[PDB]
């Protein structure tokens, strides 16, 4: 198995990393688009909400495309930003 870096599909192995700027876990990607880890997947990956672990390997599951409708939001992106929210489970 190899780590996907863009165009994420169900079942892809991915590297989930702590993004300091957004203080949220995101998928490691070469895409300009943000792929945020769904908050419900934190326990699935043994991660804590916000010392935090810098990365973990996971497997892509459900994915949703989103747009920020408010200027200040939980993803810490500007108003109008389009991004993904991805669920993931532990590898193996």
Author numbering: 1494 to 1543, 1550 to 1591
Provide passages from the article that reported this PDB entry:
The formation of autophagosomes requires the hierarchical action of a number of conserved factors, including the upstream-acting ULK1 complex containing the scaffold protein FIP200 and the downstream-acting conjugation machinery, which catalyzes the conjugation of the ubiquitin-like ATG8 proteins to the head group of phosphatidylethanolamine on the isolation membrane. Crystal structure determination shows that the FIP200 CTR contains a dimeric globular domain that we designated the “Claw” for its shape. The interaction of p62 with FIP200 is mediated by a positively charged pocket in the Claw, enhanced by p62 phosphorylation, mutually exclusive with the binding of p62 to LC3B, and it promotes degradation of ubiquitinated cargo by autophagy.
We also determined the crystal structure of the isolated Claw domain without the adjacent coiled-coil and obtained higher resolution diffraction from this material. Crystals of the isolated Claw diffracted to 1.56 Å, permitting a precise characterization of side-chain conformations and ions and waters of solvation. The isolated Claw crystallized with a monomer in the asymmetric unit; however, the unit cell contains a crystallographic 2-fold-related molecule that interacts through interface-1. These sites are of interest as sulfates ions of crystallization often serve as markers of biologically relevant phosphate binding sites. Sulfate 1 is coordinated by the main chain amide and the side-chain hydroxyl of S1532 and the guanidino groups of R1573 and R1584. Sulfate 2 is also coordinated by the side chains of R1573 and R1584. As compared to the structure of the CTR, which does not contain bound sulfate ions, R1573 moves by about 4 Å to engage the ions, while other residues in the pocket only move minimally. The proximity of these three sulfates was suggestive of a potential binding site for a tris-phosphorylated peptide segment, such as perhaps the tri-phosphorylated S365-S370 segment of p62.
